[PDB]
Design a protein around this ligand. Structure first.
Ligand code: G05
Ligand code: CL
Ligand code: CL
Ligand code: CL
Ligand code: NA
Lengths: 99, 99
């Protein structure tokens, strides 16, 4: 697809068998999802957004579908105003910015 | 251009007579620039992201040159850790996300 930016670039994701809405976010290095259950072990991570630093749970090698494209990679779980798909998974689905 | 997302999508901008580096950020509704003076009227605003909210100054009808492309719109000025070109100006340069 070619997504213009007049509205938020929201897509459906599937993680853990559940559909969720998430924002395609080229300004995010990392993918950050609201509190949910994921399998396996997690590791700690501190991330700095516009308002300051927060602790999140880092889950590696998580299966996630993004707008119908399959990805397997790192998901951070923690308090975010919206689910954001960052460059670690945007690269897996082949996304680029174009103008 | 076609910009890869293997790295942060940073470009040079010109704003208020100043050259700056900024992130092309599809996850940002608005454009947010680190503290600087701009001419004209402003009003206070609060904007929120990971880590919470910051207070910014909202300047309307500001021209910015983005990777050589002129656009006009609202610019928010405040203690952001990174300069962000948000959707309000990305639309004006015809930016799309493609996959
Ligand atoms: C109303 O307009 C705005 C504009 C921008 C924001 S934002 O900067 O908070 N942001 C909105 C998102 C969270 C819905 C844009 C987003 O692209 C920021 C943009 C950004 C980038 C870097 C620092 C601050 C903000 N990225 C971000 O938070 O990324 C997180 C993942 C990882 O990325 C590298 C930095 O560390 C983390 C944070 C909020 C409101
Ligand atoms: Cl990853
Ligand atoms: Cl605007
Ligand atoms: Cl258009
Ligand atoms: Na103005």
């Amino acid at each position: 697809p070619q997504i213009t930016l007049w509205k938020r670039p929201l897509v459906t994701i599937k993680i853990g068998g559940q559909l969720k809405e998430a924002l395609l976010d080229t300004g995010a290095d990392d993918t950050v999802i609201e509190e949910m259950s994921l399998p396996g072990r997690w590791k700690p991570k501190m991330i700095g957004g516009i308002g300051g630093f927060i602790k999140v749970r880092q889950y590696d090698q998580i299966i996630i579908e993004i707008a119908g494209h399959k990805a397997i990679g790192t998901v951070l779980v923690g308090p975010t105003p919206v689910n954001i798909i960052g460059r670690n998974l945007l690269t897996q689905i082949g996304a680029t910015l174009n103008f």
